[PDB]
Amino acid sequence: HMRTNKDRLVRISVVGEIAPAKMRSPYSVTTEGTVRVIPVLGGITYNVKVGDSAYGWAGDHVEPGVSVMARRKEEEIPLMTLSCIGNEVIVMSGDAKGSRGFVTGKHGGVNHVLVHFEEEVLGKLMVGDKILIKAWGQGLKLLDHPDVKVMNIDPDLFEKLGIQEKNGKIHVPVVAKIPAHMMGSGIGASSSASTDYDIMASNPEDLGVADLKLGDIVAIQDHDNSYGVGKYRKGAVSIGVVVHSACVSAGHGPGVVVIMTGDESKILPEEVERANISDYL
Amino acid sequence: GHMRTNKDRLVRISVVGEIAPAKMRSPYSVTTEGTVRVIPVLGGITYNVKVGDSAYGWAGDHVEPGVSVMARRKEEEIPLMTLSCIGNEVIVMSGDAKGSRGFVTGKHGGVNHVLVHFEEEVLGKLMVGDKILIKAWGQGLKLLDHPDVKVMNIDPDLFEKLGIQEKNGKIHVPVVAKIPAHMMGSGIGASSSASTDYDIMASNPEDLGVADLKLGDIVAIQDHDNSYGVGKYRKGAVSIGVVVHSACVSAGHGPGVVVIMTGDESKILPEEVERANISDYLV
Amino acid sequence: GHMRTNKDRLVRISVVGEIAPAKMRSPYSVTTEGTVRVIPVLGGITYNVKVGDSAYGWAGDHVEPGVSVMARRKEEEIPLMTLSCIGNEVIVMSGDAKGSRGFVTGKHGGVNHVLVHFEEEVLGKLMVGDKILIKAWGQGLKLLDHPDVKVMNIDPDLFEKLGIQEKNGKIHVPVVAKIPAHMMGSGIGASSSASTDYDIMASNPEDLGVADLKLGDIVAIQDHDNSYGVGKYRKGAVSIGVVVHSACVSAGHGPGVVVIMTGDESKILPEEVERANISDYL
Amino acid sequence: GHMRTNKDRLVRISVVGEIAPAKMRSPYSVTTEGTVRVIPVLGGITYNVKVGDSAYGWAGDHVEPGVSVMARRKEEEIPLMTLSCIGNEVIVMSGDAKGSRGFVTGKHGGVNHVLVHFEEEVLGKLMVGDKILIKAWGQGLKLLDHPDVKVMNIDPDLFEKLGIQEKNGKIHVPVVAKIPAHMMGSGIGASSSASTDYDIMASNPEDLGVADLKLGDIVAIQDHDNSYGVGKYRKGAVSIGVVVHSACVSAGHGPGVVVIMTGDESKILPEEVERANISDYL
Amino acid sequence: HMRTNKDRLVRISVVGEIAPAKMRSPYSVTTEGTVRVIPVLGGITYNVKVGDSAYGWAGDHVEPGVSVMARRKEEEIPLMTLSCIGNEVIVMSGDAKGSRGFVTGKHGGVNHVLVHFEEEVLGKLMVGDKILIKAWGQGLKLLDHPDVKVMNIDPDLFEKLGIQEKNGKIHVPVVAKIPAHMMGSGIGASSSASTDYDIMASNPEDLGVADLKLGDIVAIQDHDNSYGVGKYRKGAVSIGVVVHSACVSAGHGPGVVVIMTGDESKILPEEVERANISDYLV
Ligand SMILES: [Cl-]
Ligand SMILES: [Cl-]
Ligand SMILES: [Cl-]
Ligand SMILES: [Cl-]
Ligand SMILES: [Cl-]
Ligand SMILES: [Cl-]
Ligand SMILES: [Cl-]
Ligand SMILES: [Cl-]
Ligand SMILES: [Cl-]
Ligand SMILES: [Cl-]
Ligand SMILES: [Cl-]
Ligand SMILES: [Cl-]
Ligand SMILES: [K+]
Ligand SMILES: [K+]
Ligand SMILES: [K+]
Ligand SMILES: [K+]
Ligand SMILES: [K+]
């Protein structure tokens, strides 16, 4: 139990609706300059869920579970900014009205918040159904570690990640440690609070692991995410969550939402067999 | 045996639309003879034309069987048309027939409608504008032992019921007709065979050497490759498709075909049978 | 005893709209005398005026009996107006009168309304904007033994009730009046007779040689061909139509007529009767 | 020695547009092999490609020779595409090349461009958005002694220079190639042959049995009737057209053809020559 | 001089207009989470030009010379795709009408093409003035080096970069070799033909050099740019041109437009004191 400002934090209604499956072209362009016709992002994805492999799908940018978009452009920034991984989500219209889930991730660009509901719910949902996220976590501070920034994470979920304070150093279980040069699309976004960015590994063996799963906790080496996304800084480290599937185009791959950032003197990622948010929700 | 596929890597996703109105841009349809007729066209809930019926003998043009489903907005057309596969499950999500289930029978480019079969009882309860969920599944499908035979636009479970067989490294496919390249018209050159149909421009089924061509029929198209864009003429290529809409009165138009398979004549052997119609595995 | 038709080749399709508001572009209607009157006009649920009533004797202009049905949007107007046939079944799909059934009595071009008769009890439950389904059926209808006699705008089952008879390779049609070409005004020239009405510009029914002209009445128009566009003057042509809206106050307007049959006087013999009104066959 | 025409009954009218930008909906063009290329496409002032040049051998897709002319707005696209005939006079009405004159070489449907040849000196003074006047003339043209041979899309004065000859109640037409029906792709089914081109989907000119196919070339299309809509397969029909745009990389596309004549093989006898190219008759 | 396909290449009018200076906020957010009020991108920038340091200006994303934007959104793709570094630019309206310049770079997101004119021209220019780019270079291939891709570069300017063939390998003068990890904003764009991407060096010394100048030729180690932008692959190498100034926000820095990409076994960057396109535009 780290000391935080949890009691100072503001909890607020963030609304959206279930997003349709989205495609701007039938074709996805590969790194080899070839075209494939495959499903992409958005929608209710019936057979890909948090906890599944990010790899091995005939798809691109596939978002697990339910994708939630804004009612209109003006409402995209708060949706994307305030929604934190692990926040409670309630279905507010349609046949699954009253059903509860949790935020697994968010994806910038199209600006989707990604949500896990129990399987039985998914078959009752419809594109356009109203969604309430009870947004809570931005503003979170570690009072004993002011140089370690945290974000994008529900404070109750934060306490279940196996993070231990030992000797003024913050030990964090991770499945993999990713070099700065493996990060691609999304570097330079205005705020790490409001988007993911991509690990451009075409295969999980490129990251030194047999598999990378949606919901996995990873370390990003030599990236500072305190403000904008993806600042290369030797000795910086970031901790994040894997939020979407593998991708076919140059510079893309499984998305990561940052939950912690600071110096390698303070944050010690420790490689374990399993570290996945699906285990706690 | 069972064709080896990548079925388990396939993504299943919600594709949304709404029941389309009957659409007409003019009261008149222009014939091949340069005359005008006033007849029903595409869109809507068509009450007396269904998958399994003849594509011919209707006083109509581009008539779409059953329920025509359009996008909620233009931006949603590409996924509707691309991801929706013949045989996919369809659920009515608003109106008096809410909870009713049907199947995708076809899709038609231009207006960009996905065509759906529901049991006859359901049709009398439907209303234009009613919300429609397609549980889209099939794009990405590969035959793991036949890499040079491309498949598309087809629900994997429905694909298994088409009487298709592996032998001697070749795929045998039952069809009602084999259609020459020169009989294909409107829709050649579309960007992607995954997202449209193209027309057989036969005025009469006898022009194809058959007594009838029915909505839902499986046909072969000779000397057309449909791997990427639509309707590349190539000597020795063969495509398999499904008939999806009715006969048409204007030059270059006729019953629509959605391609489900394409490759080389050395690998795909269409074999002419009396009956090969998806309604047998769907109505 | 039916005429041979291609009825079985005809396509039945959903045509949608919604109950139209009462519409007025000005408070005033301009008369043929160049004066102004403030009176109700077209659109709406008209509580007071119905198929079978006189087209004359109302303090109103272009009054549409029963329920006026318009398109959801402009792009849907053509199929609404083209495919909807007199006598087609109509079903209320939203609001308090949801499930109620009626019949198309007519259609009026310009504002593009299809006009619908429901039972009187229904009207008081209806609201402007309530959703309407027309089960459109009849366009494409051909008389297989009379290829030169064109039919349109008419539900085939209603067509069989009009007292029309084959004899000697000709068609006898009961009508209340036969209207000269020069009595037809507004709507001549419309692209298609399938998609609109045109006006009988008689100020009084006596101008037509009859004591009354009623909404629903079956009439002949002499020397007009309506095979394609509306109102082609041709000596010896004859058209048959149905009266669909009320008398009118402005020059060139009057009770509207939707054409259901057109051909030559050698083939179509209108025969004047006391009564020929579609309300009798609801 | 002219054919008898209704030339004097034809209406000459102003058709306007403006110089179109280069247009691309994606940086990539998708090939028949399912790969992507980044290359120039249609629209614009193409400095480098002109009527008379090969339709093949460019690193490009749908490249339109000379100056591409589009409509000021969507509502003006139909008359632009319909009335503009190959060989019509074109006048620059604004910008630095104001007063310069050129000739219509073709037109391309979809984006709806009319393609124009100006002298080379003019091109360097032109700007996208400069105003363009086409003196449209030729739609309505009939061959008075060959009623079953339809002509279209062609300036009558240009028509007289094509080496076409009457003999024995038949029409002999010089062509560089005769193209089978099955070689025609994109554009089949368009409402009207008067308002668009359609594509020869040959990847290489050798697929057509010729060493080269040039922009401006006169070709025959075997077994296609183009009297009304585009590309009706009919055994024994023959069409004559002009090649109007470059080879293409996607399935079902290739050099575009605007039809100028259509009828039966009993009346129209295409005769293969070494050269038949409209650039010779500017 | 390398064998190319220069002869198949299409040259086409790409238009735009001079862009205003653009700011979405008065504040620019730094890597330290502070705000500064400083000039940004767009406009005619009077005192920053190709050849100047990318660093040491109190500004963010500063674009040298004249920033050119599309007339409308639909025209952005061709502007950004077809415009090649070194292409000729002609002013088509305003007080400097007829003045010629050269493309120095392009910048994705806002989608500006950057242009160098002689200094005297700049004082005559106005935001909104019409701009013609004679676009030429996309489609360029090295016929003897099929696995070395080139792009975004005027073929004549390409021949001035001191690039030499020896032993089936390509030697390229560069001022710096930049590690993959120093590349940020713009990775993952659909096409390297239509955007730049950022070197996120806060200071030039972060790249092992005293200075990095606008117009500098650089190597990016372990990035493949054949299709989409910034694919990390060990052993790939890309060559690019520095196109805009240093940036204050995380993940941004001087922008690079890629002109060549391939394998380290074929492309040999060689570090020199000076390699800058300002030495050769004209
Ligand atoms: Cl999930
Ligand atoms: Cl690194
Ligand atoms: Cl059906
Ligand atoms: Cl194979
Ligand atoms: Cl053939
Ligand atoms: Cl009534
Ligand atoms: Cl009164
Ligand atoms: Cl008269
Ligand atoms: Cl030209
Ligand atoms: Cl090439
Ligand atoms: Cl053929
Ligand atoms: Cl400059
Ligand atoms: K999803
Ligand atoms: K339908
Ligand atoms: K009414
Ligand atoms: K051009
Ligand atoms: K500038």
User: In Å, how far is A245's CA from the nearest CA of chain E?
Assistant: 15
Work out whether strand A164-166 and strand A169-174 pair parallel, antiparallel, or are unpaired.
antiparallel
CA gap B185, D225 in Å, rounded: 12
Beta-carbon contacts of A52 under 8 Å, excluding residues fewer than 6 positions away, are A64, A213, A214
Tokens encoding E150: 């080139």
Residues in chain D after which the chain is broken, C→N over 2.5 Å: none
Distance CA(C55)–CA(B224), nearest Å, equals: 62
Do E and C share at least 3 CB pairs under 8 Å?
Answer: no
DSSP C195-216: S--EEB--SSGGGGTSS--BTT
SS (H, E, C) A209-231: CCCCECCEEEEEEEEECCCCCCE
Put simply, the answer to whether A35 touches B194 (Cβ < 8 Å) is no
**Which ligand has the nearest atom to the CA of C113?**
15
Residue whose C-alpha is closest to residue B155's, from B73, B209, B88, B75: B88
Say if the Cβ atoms of A128 and B16 lie within 8 Å: yes
Handedness of CA D215, D218, D223, D229 (dihedral sign): positive
Q: Which of D21, D28, D48 sits opposite E10 (nearest CB)?
A: D48
**C170: three-class secondary structure by DSSP:** coil
| D37–chain A nearest CA distance, Å | 8
Spatial neighbors of C187 by CB under 8 A, at least 6 apart, are: C109, C196, C197, C198, C199, C230, C231, C256
Structure token digits, residue A280: 């706690």
Distance CA D280, CA D217 (A): 10
CA of B180 to the centre of ligand 11 (A): 8
Partner residue opposite D48 with nearest CB, options E11, E75, E81: E11
Q: What type of residue is B105?
A: T
In the reported structure, the alpha carbon of residue C82 is separated from the centroid of ligand 3 by a whole-number distance in angstroms of 24
- The single residue listed with the structure tokens 């639509």 is B230
- Kindly determine whether residue A58 and residue B131, on different chains, have CB atoms separated by under 8 Å: no
Tell the burial category of C272 from Cβ atoms under 10 Å away from its Cβ (0-12, 13-18, 19+). middle
| B58: helix, strand or coil | coil
Architecture, CATH, for domain D12-25+65-141: Beta Barrel (2.40)
Q: How far apart are CA D239 and CA D153, in angstroms?
A: 13
Torsion angles phi and psi, residue D220, rounded to 5? -105, 145
Which tokens go with A164?
Answer: 């231990």
Chain B residues near residue D230 by CB distance under 8 angstroms: 251-252
b/e map of C108-141 (b: 16 or more CB within 10 Å)?
Answer: bbebbbbbbbbeeebbeebebebbbbbbbbbbbb
Beta bridge partners of B107: B114
- State the structure-solving technique: X-ray
CA–CA gap between residue D137 and residue D7 (Å, rounded): 10
Q: Say whether A44 and B14 touch across the interface (CB within 8 A).
A: yes
Distances (CA, A) of A215 to A191, A276, C178, D55, D127: 21, 5, 81, 54, 55
Amino acid making up residue D234: R
First to last CA, chain C: 20
Closest CA to D174 of D209, D220, D212: D220
Three-state secondary-structure class, residue B193: coil
Question: Which chain B residues contact residue D33 at CB under 8 A?
Answer: 228
Contacting residues for C66 by C-beta, under 8 A, at least 6 apart = C45, C46, C49, C50, C51, C102, C105, C115, C116, C117, C118, C123
Whether B250 and D228 lie within 8 Å, measured CB to CB? yes
In chain D, ranges of CATH 4.10.1180.10 domains? 26-64
- Number of residues that this document lists for chain C: 282
Distance CA D83, CA D179 (A): 26
* Tokens encoding D112: 């709806």
Q: Measured between alpha carbons, how far is residue E209 from residues E53, E64, E174 in Å?
A: 12, 21, 12
**Superfamily of domain covering E1-10+141-282:** tm1086 (SG structure) domain (2.102.30.10)
Burial class for A10, CB neighbours closer than 10 Å (0-12, 13-18, 19+):
exposed
* Nearest Cα to Cα of residue E99 among E126, E79, E62, E78: E126
Beta strands in chain B (DSSP E): 13-19, 29-30, 36-37, 45-46, 66-70, 89-92, 101-108, 113-117, 131-136, 150-151, 165-167, 170-175, 177-179, 198-199, 218-225, 232-243, 256-264, 268-272
Distance D66 CA to ligand 16 centre (A): 5
Distances (CA, A) of B179 to B186, B216, B243, E102: 15, 15, 12, 55
Helix %, strand %, coil % for chain D, to 5?
10, 35, 50
Provide CATH 2.40.10.170 ranges for chain D: 12-25+65-141
Distance of alpha carbon B244 from alpha carbon B62, whole angstroms:
10
Residues 6+ apart with CB under 8 A from C152: B38, C85, C138, C139, C141, C193, C194, C259, C260, C261, C262
Distance CA B182, CA D234 (A): 10
Nearest to residue E274, comparing CAs of E154, E164, E176?
E176
Give the H/E segment covering residue C122. Answer: helix C120-123
Instruction: Using CA atoms of A18, A20, A24, A28 in order, give the dihedral in degrees to the nearest 10.
Output: 100
How far apart, in whole angstroms, are the C-alpha atoms of residue E228 and residue D27? 11
Touching A (3+ Cβ pairs <8 A), the chains are B, D, E
How far is residue D5's CA from residue A272's CA, in Å, rounded to a whole number? 88
Q: Centre a 10 Å sphere on the Cβ of residue E119 and count the other Cβ atoms it contains.
A: 10
Q: Which ligand is nearest to the CA of A103?
A: 1
Strand partners, D45: D67
Q: How far apart are CA C261 and CA C183, in angstroms?
A: 18
Residue B5: other Cβ atoms inside 10 A: 18
Instruction: Pick the residue of E12, E74, E143, E154 with the most D CBs within 10 A to test the interface with D by mutation.
Output: E12
Cα–Cα distance for residue pair D233/D258, rounded to 1 Å: 17
Looking at chain A, which residues constitute the CATH 4.10.1180.10 domain(s)? 25-63
Beta bridge partners of E16: E131
Q: What distance in Å separates the CA atoms of residue B50 and residue B60, rounded to the nearest whole number?
A: 14
Chain B residue with minimum CA distance to A61: B11
The residue of chain E with its CA nearest to that of A234 is E181
- Closest by CA position to B231, among listed A243, D187, A278: D187
Instruction: Give Cα B113 distance to the centre of its chain.
Output: 11
- The Cα A170–Cα D90 span in angstroms is 76
Q: Would you state the CATH architecture of domain A25-63?
A: Irregular (4.10)
The residue type found at B46 is T
Range(s) of chain C covered by CATH 2.102.30.10: 1-11+142-282
Query: Distance between CA D197 and CA D231 in Å, rounded?
Result: 10
Superfamily of domain C1-11+142-282: tm1086 (SG structure) domain (2.102.30.10)
Residues E220-253 as b/e (b if ≥16 CB within 10 A, e otherwise) read bbbbbbbbbbbbbbeebbbbbbbbbbbbbbbbbb
Task: Determine which of B188, B207, B227, B234 to mutate to test the interface with D (most D C-beta atoms within 10 Å).
Answer: B188
Beta-bridge partners for A224:
A231
Tokens of B182: 């020169």
**Total residues belonging to chain E:** 282
Question: Strand, coil or helix: what is D45?
Answer: strand
| Residue ranges, CATH 2.102.30.10, chain A | 1-10+141-281
Contact between chain C and chain A (3 or more Cβ pairs less than 8 Å apart): no
Centre of ligand 4 to C-alpha B147, Å, is 5
Q: End-to-end alpha-carbon separation of chain D, Å?
A: 20
- Decide yes or no: CATH 2.102.30.10 for domain B1-11+142-283: yes
Q: Could you count the other beta carbons within 10 Å of the beta carbon of residue C4? A: 11
Both tokens of residue A2? Answer: 């780290």
Residue C12 to residue B48, Cβ atoms within 8 A? yes
Q: Which of D25, D38, D61 to mutate to test the interface with E (most CBs of E within 10 A)?
A: D38
Q: How far apart are the first and last CA of chain A?
A: 19
Q: What is the CATH number of domain A11-24+64-140?
A: 2.40.10.170
CA E131 / ligand 16 centre spacing (Å):
17
**Which residue from E175, E182, E220 is spatially nearest to E200, judged by alpha carbons?**
E182
Contact A113, A103 (CB under 8 A): yes
Nearest-Å Rg of the Cα atoms of chain C is 18
State the virtual CA torsion across D165, D170, D172, D173 in degrees, nearest 10: 100
Q: How is domain B26-64 classified at the architecture level of CATH?
A: Irregular (4.10)
Q: How far apart are CA D156 and CA C30, in angstroms?
A: 51
Q: Which two tokens stand for residue B136?
A: 């889209």
| Three-class DSSP labels, D53-102 | CECCCCECCCCCCEEEEECCCHHHHHHHHHHCCECCEEEECCCCCCCCEE
CB contact (8 A) between residue B228 and residue D199: no
Reference B193, options B260, B112, B104; nearest CA is: B260
Domain at A1-10+141-281: CATH code: 2.102.30.10
Write phi, then psi, for A73 (nearest 5 degrees): -55, -45
E contacts of A188 (beta carbons < 8 Å): 184-186, 198, 200, 249-252
Please give the sequence-ordered ranges of beta strands (E in DSSP) within C34-94, or none if there are none. 36-37, 45-46, 66-70, 89-92
DSSP assignment letter at A44: E
**E147: which DSSP letter?**
T
**Run of H or E including C113:** strand C113-117
For CATH 2.40.10.170, the residue range(s) in chain E are 11-24+64-140
Long-range contacts of D209-214 (CB under 8 A, 24+ apart): D209/D177, D210/D176, D210/D177, D212/D54, D212/D56, D213/D54, D213/D55, D213/D56, D213/D176, D213/D177, D213/D243, D213/D255, D214/D52, D214/D53, D214/D54, D214/D55, D214/D176, D214/D243, D214/D277
Closest-CA residue to D244 (of D36, D42, D70)? D42
Residue A271's contacts (CB-CB under 8 Å, 6 or more residues apart) are A174, A175, A176, A177
